[PDB]
Every structure is written in C-alpha cells, then in structure tokens.
Amino acid sequence: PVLRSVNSREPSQVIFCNRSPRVVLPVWLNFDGEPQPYPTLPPGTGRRIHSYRGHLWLFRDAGTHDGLLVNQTELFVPSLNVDGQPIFANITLPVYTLKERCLQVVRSLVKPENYRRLDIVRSLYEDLEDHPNVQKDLERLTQERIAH
Amino acid sequence: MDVFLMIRRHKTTIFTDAKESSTVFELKRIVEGILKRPPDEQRLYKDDQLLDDGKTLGECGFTSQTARPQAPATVGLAFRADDTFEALCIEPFSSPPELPDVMK
Amino acid sequence: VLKPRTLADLIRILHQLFAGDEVNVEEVQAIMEAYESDPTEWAMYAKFDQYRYTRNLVDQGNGKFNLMILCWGEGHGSSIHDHTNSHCFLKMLQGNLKETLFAWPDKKSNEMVKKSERVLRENQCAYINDSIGLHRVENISHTEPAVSLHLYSPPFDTCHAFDQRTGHKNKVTMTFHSKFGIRTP
Amino acid sequence: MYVKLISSDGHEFIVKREHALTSGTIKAMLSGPGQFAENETNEVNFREIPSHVLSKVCMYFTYKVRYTNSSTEIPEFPIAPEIALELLMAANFLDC
Numbered sequence: 001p002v003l004r005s006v007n008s009r010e011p012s013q014v015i016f017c018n019r020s021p022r023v024v025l026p027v028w029l030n031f032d033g034e035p036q037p038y039p040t041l042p043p044g045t046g047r048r049i050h051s052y053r054g055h056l057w058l059f060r061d062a063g064t065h066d067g068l069l070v071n072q073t074e075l076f077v078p079s080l081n082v083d084g085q086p087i088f089a090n091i092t093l094p095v096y097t098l099k100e101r102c103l104q105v106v107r108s109l110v111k112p113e114n115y116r117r118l119d120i121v122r123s124l125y126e127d128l129e130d131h132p133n134v135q136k137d138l139e140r141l142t143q144e145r146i147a148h
Numbered sequence: 149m150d151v152f153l154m155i156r157r158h159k160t161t162i163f164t165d166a167k168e169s170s171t172v173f174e175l176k177r178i179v180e181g182i183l184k185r186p187p188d189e190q191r192l193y194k195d196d197q198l199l200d201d202g203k204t205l206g207e208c209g210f211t212s213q214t215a216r217p218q219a220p221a222t223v224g225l226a227f228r229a230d231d232t233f234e235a236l237c238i239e240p241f242s243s244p245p246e247l248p249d250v251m252k
Numbered sequence: 253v254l255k256p257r258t259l260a261d262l263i264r265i266l267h268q269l270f271a272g273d274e275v276n277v278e279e280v281q282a283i284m285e286a287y288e289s290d291p292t293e294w295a296m297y298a299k300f301d302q303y304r305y306t307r308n309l310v311d312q313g314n315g316k317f318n319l320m321i322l323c324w325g326e327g328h329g330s331s332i333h334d335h336t337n338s339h340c341f342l343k344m345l346q347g348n349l350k351e352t353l354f355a356w357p358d359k360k361s362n363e364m365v366k367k368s369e370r371v372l373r374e375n376q377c378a379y380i381n382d383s384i385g386l387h388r389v390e391n392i393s394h395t396e397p398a399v400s401l402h403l404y405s406p407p408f409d410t411c412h413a414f415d416q417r418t419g420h421k422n423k424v425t426m427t428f429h430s431k432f433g434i435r436t437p
Numbered sequence: 438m439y440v441k442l443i444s445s446d447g448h449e450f451i452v453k454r455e456h457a458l459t460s461g462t463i464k465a466m467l468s469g470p471g472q473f474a475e476n477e478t479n480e481v482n483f484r485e486i487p488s489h490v491l492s493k494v495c496m497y498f499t500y501k502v503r504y505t506n507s508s509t510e511i512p513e514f515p516i517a518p519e520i521a522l523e524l525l526m527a528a529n530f531l532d533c
C-alpha cells in the first residue's frame with residue numbers, strides 16, 4: 001500500500017484546525033494503510049495534537065463522511081518540527097460541485113430505503129446511493145499518485 | 149476409503165491422510181507442498197521396501213485396518229542431495245519411563 | 253529469559269504460561285518487559301477518546317486471563333480501584349504513566365494515604381494485586397499520549413472505585429471502547 | 438494450512454492447522470492475536486512434552502477430527518499403560 005504512514009517514531013506537533021461548518025472526523029492511515037478514526041473536532045475548534053513525521057491524515061464530515069480539504073488538498077503529511085515550531089493543518093470545505101452538494105442535501109433529508117421514491121431520473125438514484133467513502137477516495141488517490 | 153499416515157524423515161513427522169486408491173506419486177506431491185521438494189528428489193519406503201511411483205497405496209500395504217487415525221502407518225522419506233540419494237534415516241521417538249508399580 | 257520477538261510471540265508465550273498449573277508472576281512480568289514495543293504490531297488497538305481513556309480488548313485468554321490495551325490522552329487518569337483479587341500486569345507501549353499506590357481505607361471516613369508514587373518508563377512492566385494495595389494511574393504528560401498493555405488473571409469486569417476524600421467505595425462495571433480492533437459502542 | 442509442533446527432545450511434528458486447534462490451548466494461541474504473522478515461522482515449542490507423548494497427541498488430533506461428525510459408530514482411542522500418565526499431563530496442559 002503506497003498511501004500509509006511511515007513508522008518514523010520522530011514526533012511532530014500538529015495543530016488541527018477545523019474551519020468548516022462541519023463536525024470534522026480526523027482519519028489517520030496506519031502503517032498498513034487502513035483508516036483509523038480519531039476524536040471529532042467541532043466547527044471553529046483547534047487542537048495541538050501529537051503525531052509523527054511521515055504519518056498520513058485525511059479529514060471527513062463526521063456524520064456523512066463527505067470529503068474535506070486540509071491546507072487546500074486531500075492528504076496531510078507533517079514534516080519535522082523546524083526548531084520546535086508546530087505544523088498547522090487547516091481543515092476547510094472544498095468547493096463542491098453543485099451536483100455533489102445537492103446530493104449531500106438530499107441524502108440528509110431522505111432515508112436511503114426511500115431514495116427511489118423520488119421523482120427524479122434513475123441515474124440519480126445510483127448517484128444518491130454512491131455514498132462518500134474513505135476507501136473509495138483512497139483508491140483514486142493511490143492511482144492518482146502512481147500516475148505521477 | 150482413507151488411510152492415515154506418518155511420513156517420517158530424521159526428526160520430522162508429517163501427519164496426513166490419503167485415499168487407499170491414491171498413488172505413491174500423488175503422495176510425493178503432498179510432501180512437495182509441505183517440504184518444498186519435487187517428487188523426482190523423493191523416495192518413499194514402507195519399512196525398508198522402496199515404493200514405486202505408479203503403485204497405489206493399497207497395493208503397497210496401506211489399508212484401513214493398518215493405517216487408522218488413532219494409529220497411523222509410517223512412511224519413510226529420503227531426500228536426494230545433488231548427485232545421489234541419502235540413506236533412509238528416521239530417529240525413533242523418546243521412550244516412556246518404566247511403568248509405576250502401582251500400575252501393576 | 254525468553255525475549256518475545258513480536259507482540260504475537262509474547263501472546264503465544266503468555267497462553268502457554270497460563271496453561272500450566274502454576275503461574276509465576278515474576279516470569280510473566282519479566283517476559284512482558286522483554287518485549288520491545290513496536291507500534292506496527294499493536295496500532296490497530298490504539299483508539300483514543302478526547303475526554304477519557306479507552307479500554308481496548310485484545311485477547312480473552314481462553315477464559316484464564318484478559319489482555320487489553322489502554323490508551324491515555326493528555327492528562328487522562330484512572331480512579332482508585334481494586335483488582336477483584338486478580339493479578340494485574342501493566343506494560344508501557346508508548347509514553348509514560350504515573351502509578352500512585354494507596355493503602356486500603358480504614359472504616360473511619362478520612363483521607364486515604366499514598367504509600368508510594370512512581371512513573372513507569374516505556375517498555376517497563378509493573379505488577380499489582382489486592383495484597384500490595386490499591387493504585388491509580390495517570391498520564392501526566394501535557395503533550396504526549398500514553399499506551400499501555402494490561403494483563404488480568406482471572407479476567408474481571410467488575411471492581412470498586414474509591415473516593416480519596418473518604419475511602420468509601422462504589423462498584424463499577426468496566427466497558428470496552430473496542431474489541432479485537434472493532435469499535436464497540 | 439500446516440503448523441509445526443516441536444517436542445522437548447527436538448522432534449518436529451507437522452500437522453494440519455485445524456487438527457491442532459483441537460487443543461484449546463493451541464486454539465487460544467493461534468485463533469486471536471497470537472496468530473503467526475507471515476514473517477514468522479509457524480512453529481510452537483513444547484519444551485516439556487516428549488516426542489513419544491506429542492506424537493500420541495497428534496494421533497488424537499487426527500482421531501477427533503475424523504470421528505467427531507460420525508453418526509453410527511466410532512472406535513476407541515487406545516492408550517498404552519506406559520504413556521498414560523505423561524499423556525494425561527499433556528492433555529491437561531493442552532486443554533483437549
């Protein structure tokens with residue numbers, strides 16, 4: 001697995017900073033590349049947390065698992081603290097497409113067993129059911145990086 | 149109809165089963181999957197009688213009455229190192245202490 | 253001494269030790285100390301909570317012992333508890349914990365006494381039972397988490413929390429944040 | 438699929454993994470986190486069970502797996518008097 005944390009054991013202080021209106025779920029990718037969640041961050045909350053050089057993080061909506069950005073991209077790897085300076089991780093909303101944002105709103109209002117009771121074209125039923133998922137994003141991100 | 153075997157070489161003992169109708173060569177394929185040696189580098193014995201690849205286990209003498217799960221039959225195994233085959237060598241198991249007198 | 257090469261090796265050795273008629277606590281503590289903590293072998297059990305420490309069950313030990321990993325946030329600590337007359341081993345996998353030992357309370361309602369106080373360095377393994385006294389463990393680090401490996405034999409889900417004001421008890425049943433790497437709410 | 442069991446006198450017994458799980462002690466060892474990582478050798482050392490007892494235990498593994506689902510008749514497991522006490526202690530340690 002190419003997307004995984006390196007067992008550096010070289011500590012690195014990080015400031016997690018939530019600037020979305022969402023409750024943020026920090027997701028650490030362990031040494032086998034598998035996602036391990038961490039305590040959530042309320043909107044407007046910042047925390048000094050303990051991490052390590054070469055460790056991989058991503059950030060999601062804690063309730064819906066919508067993807068979020070950290071320092072304007074999808075993955076966050078802290079360097080080593082330069083002279084003891086913490087490393088900042090700024091968590092924001094991405095600019096979703098109108099379609100993905102509309103799917104988020106409909107998913108929040110309609111139960112999944114009731115998606116196909118909606119008077120919309122069927123291709124949108126499959127879109128509604130394709131719920132945001134960390135494992136699918138890791139697939140795209142992995143192949144995105146191999147294609148340098 | 150299954151026979152149950154102890155394939156023995158030096159201090160190694162493999163517990164496995166096979167059909168009475170399976171061949172000696174098929175048994176070497178089983179040994180190959182375990183000890184990573186192809187059948188061409190293997191010799192199988194019943195006591196001191198070397199067994200031919202094409203003969204079935206029943207024809208060699210391994211039957212349900214002589215190769216039971218609770219009392220498997222012993223197959224000797226000799227590997228071949230480079231040019232020639234090693235001598236069949238099996239070290240016996242340890243021996244129990246003498247029976248306590250209170251056990252008659 | 254048998255130095256466990258991996259965490260799985262240590263667990264296999266522990267299952268053999270507790271299979272015997274007689275378990276030697278000096279031998280268990282020494283073998284648990286000898287395992288050098290490797291986060292790549294136990295990270296799946298390190299699940300943290302922001303406000304409280306977590307208990308993550310690792311192995312149920314064939315009903316003879318319990319193996320669990322506890323994860324301590326900054327400033328997270330235990331209550332003063334007994335061990336339901338069972339052996340309890342505590343090995344540090346990451347960070348440090350400060351163990352403070354207490355004497356059993358008198359029946360008059362006054363401040364429990366601290367018999368001693370120490371900080372367990374990482375890879376060190378401590379031992380405690382009810383005969384040596386009550387204890388409380390804390391992660392005193394303001395910046396670092398703590399991860400510890402606990403062995404309890406016999407396994408117990410109940411114990412007693414102790415107010416240090418009083419010495420008065422109250423029974424507690426202990427939950428699990430996860431079991432075998434799976435979150436259990 | 439196969440696991441290696443080593444007696445105190447150094448005899449190596451290669452038996453099927455599911456046969457060895459007949460022992461409750463071995464099952465506790467290898468069913469959970471004690472399972473061999475695949476960088477590890479699938480070896481278990483029993484430094485106090487001699488080979489003439491460990492081979493007998495493996496014969497019991499075969500016997501138990503063969504006849505557990507039988508529904509009309511099973512044979513008796515034979516135990517010679519000379520090994521009865523040593524085998525009883527191994528059976529107690531192995532929980533089977």
Ligand SMILES: CC(=O)N[C@H](C(=O)N1C[C@H](O)C[C@H]1C(=O)NCc1ccc(-c2cc[nH]n2)c2ccccc12)C(C)(C)C
Pocket residue numbers: 007009016026028038039040041047049050051052055291294295298300301302303324325326346397399
């Ligand atoms: C040597 C090594 O690799 N050890 C790993 C290790 O320490 N890891 C791997 C990663 O780098 C994060 C860091 C870790 O667990 N830090 C503690 C921590 C971080 C972040 C938060 C947080 C998230 C949102 N708010 N607060 C915490 C919240 C409560 C308690 C502890 C928290 C380990 C194997 C233990 C998982």
Ligand SMILES: [Fe+2]
Pocket residue numbers: 333334335340387
């Ligand atoms: Fe305790």
